[PDB]
Amino acid sequence: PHHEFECSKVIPERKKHAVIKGKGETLADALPQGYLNTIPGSISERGCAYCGAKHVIGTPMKDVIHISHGPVGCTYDTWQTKRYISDNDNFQLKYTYATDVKEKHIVFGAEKLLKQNIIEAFKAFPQIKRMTIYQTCATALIGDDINAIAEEVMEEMPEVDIFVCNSPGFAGPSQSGGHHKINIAWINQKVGTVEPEITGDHVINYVGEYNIQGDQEVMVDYFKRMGIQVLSTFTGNGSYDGLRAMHRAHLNVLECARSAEYICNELRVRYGIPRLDIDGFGFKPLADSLRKIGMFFGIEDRAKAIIDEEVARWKPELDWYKERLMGKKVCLWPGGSKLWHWAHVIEEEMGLKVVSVYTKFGHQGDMEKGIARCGEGTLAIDDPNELEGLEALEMLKPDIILTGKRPGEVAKKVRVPYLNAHAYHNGPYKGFEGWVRFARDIYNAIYSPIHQLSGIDITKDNAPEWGNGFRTRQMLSDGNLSDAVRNSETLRQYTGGYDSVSKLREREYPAFERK
């Protein structure tokens, strides 16, 4: 049934956005509202539609000048806050561009300014011949025609290609409207405009993947170990001109359905490319995902070889953590897709009890998937605000939350540890290895001896009379383990190094024989 928060009784519209998965309830009984307007003054977790378009989907493209047409603030505010990496020396993290719209441009427009900026940027970055221009609140409102100015520059400079994304912050209630806008602009303006070199019998688009801490490189590792040509990644570690050849893929492999279902759906309608939805996280969801892609291309034996090898390498480490995490409570409090990617498999494979999930900007489709996947009792929230998050911490008393940075720092004050679900701690978290890293970070957060320390009141006359000047994580975690578990000769802590991704970049892949 629906759930009301004490703190939101005065705004009863909120009751529609939360449900507790009740005994015997199905998806036809209760589902939160989603993708509605935000309540002003609520202290909602939500961002703008420029965020959704430019900051989340656009900027990951690794070989592109990402220029926001507007005042410098929108640009500064999205710079050096993301961990989408690339094998183009993190160009997309290191360089950002703003038109620096001023007062005089409000009356008269900023079209000339836009053009001068484009020329200046191509001049400063002669190795870069691709560009996306993102509209902001100010340039939407003053009405500059960005598409015209881009065309005007593409005429004059036939060596460059410029994409236009008209997704200002106020265009919709959240991130989500920005997702839709940039998907549809891309397929309309750009898909079909490049004929690719094909180098294999088996061609995919990898869609809805943004390469946080190397997630994409993890997954493309597996694909290349199967002799699949990844034609495109939308958009993590992705190439602008690669993504203009999406119309030639054999299969759309969709991880983040929230952000990228729009383009997969239109790619089916326009070109008859089928949509297969996958999970990048956990052993079973990933094994299933890879098996399916294998079968599809009639190379299932190659998938099974990867799966067996990876599971043999890493399961003894995942299960070490599972034993220590069994029954610990967790809130999956990302913005979107991650809540349902993790919901079931995190309980199964890590032993955690999911007590809450939330989405900042998700649709009712995301709560379908989330509620479908969690257990009864779970509290699901659409468009959470701060007070509601705080109240849920007091009511549910989770051992850890997985959430954003600043939300995590709210929880810190009330003695709830966090991992950054968005940017990760020691990522990447996709893949078999990544799943273990994920588990270890959760283990380290829950059984932190500093956390133990922080709960002790030293003014209190019957205080814990400390003996040694330390407690190890294991002293805090292993006390009530069975001897079988404590003495296992197979179970061990994570053995990978600090950076699990740089090895992948230096790796040669066996070629396969084309028909």
Partner 1 sequence: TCEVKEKGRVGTINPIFTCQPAGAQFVSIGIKDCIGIVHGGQGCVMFVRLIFSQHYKESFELASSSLHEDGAVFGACGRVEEAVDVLLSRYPDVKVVPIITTCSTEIIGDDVDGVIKKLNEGLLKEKFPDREVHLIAMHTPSFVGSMISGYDVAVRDVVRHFAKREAPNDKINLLTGWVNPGDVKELKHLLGEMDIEANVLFEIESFDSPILPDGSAVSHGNTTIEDLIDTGNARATFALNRYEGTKAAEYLQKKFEIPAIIGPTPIGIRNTDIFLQNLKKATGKPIPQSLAHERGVAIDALADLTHMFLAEKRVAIYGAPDLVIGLAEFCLDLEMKPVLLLLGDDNSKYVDDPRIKALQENVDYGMEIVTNADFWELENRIKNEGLELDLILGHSKGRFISIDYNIPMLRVGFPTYDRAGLFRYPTVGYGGAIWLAEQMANTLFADMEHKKNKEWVLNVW
Contact residues: ligand CLF, CB under 6 A: 48, 50, 70-71, 73-74, 77, 136-138, 168-169
Pick from 4, 27, 73, 509: which binds partner 1 (CB under 8 A)? 73
Write down the residue that tokens 């593409």 correspond to: 154
Closer residue to ligand CLF (CB): 136 or 183: 136
Helix (H, G, I), strand (E, B) or coil at 270: helix
d(CA 370, CA 32): 11
The residue length of the chain stands at 515
**Residue 96 binds which entry of ligand CLF, partner 1, none, with Cβ cut-offs from 5 to 8 Å by kind?**
partner 1
Residue 194 tokens read as: 């490049």
Cα 72 from Cα 53, distance rounded (Å): 17
* CA dist., res. 445 & res. 451, Å (int): 8
Q: Which of 78, 135, 166, 216: binder of partner 1 (CB under 8 A)?
A: 78
The correct pick among 158, 467, 479, 510 for binding partner 1 (CB under 8 A) is 467
Shortest approach of partner 1 to residue 64 CB, angstroms?
A: 14
Contact 367, 380 (CB under 8 A): yes
Our CB check for ligand CLF shows the closer of 52 and 285 to be: 52
Contact (Cβ atoms closer than 8 angstroms) between residue 514 and residue 299:
no
Which one of partner 1, ligand CLF, none interacts with residue 198, CB within 5 to 8 A by kind? none
* 456 contacts partner 1 (rule: CB under 8 A): yes
Among 18, 19, 138, 149, binds partner 1 (CB under 8 A): 138
Q: How far is the CB of 168 from ligand CLF (least distance, A)?
A: 5
Which residue carries 């759930």 as its tokens? 3
Please report how many Cα atoms fall inside a 13 Å half-sphere around the Cα of residue 294, on the Cβ side: 18
Task: Record the tokens describing residue 274, joined without a space.
Answer: 């089928």
End-to-end CA distance of the chain: 56
Q: Name the residue nearer to partner 1 (CB basis): 469 or 510.
A: 469
Identify what 514 binds: ligand CLF, partner 1, none; CB under 5 to 8 Å per kind.
Answer: none
Burial class (CB in 10 A: 0-12, 13-18, 19+), 397: exposed
Identify the H or E element spanning 182: helix 176-189
Q: Least distance to ligand CLF from the beta carbon of 126, Å?
A: 29
Contact code string over 48-67 relative to partner 1, x by CB under 8 A: xxxx----------------
Q: Does 475 sit near partner 1 (CB under 8 A)?
A: yes
Q: Please identify which residue in the block is written with the tokens 């990522």.
A: 427
Question: From the CB of 348, what's the least distance to partner 1, in Å?
Answer: 23
| Choice between 30 and 212, CB closer to partner 1 | 212
Using CB under 8 A, pick the residue from 159, 498, 508, 513 that binds partner 1.
498
Select the residue interacting with partner 1 from 247, 250, 341, 425 (CB under 8 A): 425
Nearer to ligand CLF, 5 or 50 (CB): 50
What the block records as the tokens of 258 is 């929230």
Query: Whole-angstrom Cα distance, residue 475 to residue 481?
Result: 11
User: Among ligand CLF, partner 1, none, what does residue 513 contact (CB within 5–8 Å per kind)?
Assistant: none
Site stretch for partner 1 (CB under 8 A), options 191-199, 325-333, 457-465, 505-513: 457-465
Tokens of 441: 């970070």
Give the residue closest to ligand CLF by C-beta: 169
Compute the least distance from the CB of residue 53 to partner 1, in Å: 11
**DSSP assignment letter at 463:** -
**Contact call for residues 86 and 62 (beta carbons, < 8 A):** yes
In the complex, minimum distance from the CB of residue 113 to ligand CLF, in angstroms, rounded to a whole number: 14
What lies within 8 Å, CB to CB, of 461 at 6+ separation is none
Instruction: Give the distance from CA 220 to its chain's centroid.
Output: 16
Contact between 477 and partner 1 per CB under 8 A = no
CA distance 411 to 390: 7
Binding residues for partner 1 restricted to 141-200, rule: CB under 8 A: 141-142, 168-174
Phi, psi for 38 (deg, rounded to 5)? -90, 145
Q: Which of residues 212-271 bind partner 1 (CB under 8 A)?
A: 213
Residue whose CB is less far from ligand CLF, 78 or 183 = 78
Residue whose entry in the numeric block shows the structure tokens 């999930």? 357
Q: How many residues at the interface with partner 1, by CB under 8 A?
A: 114
CB of 138 to partner 1, least distance (A): 4
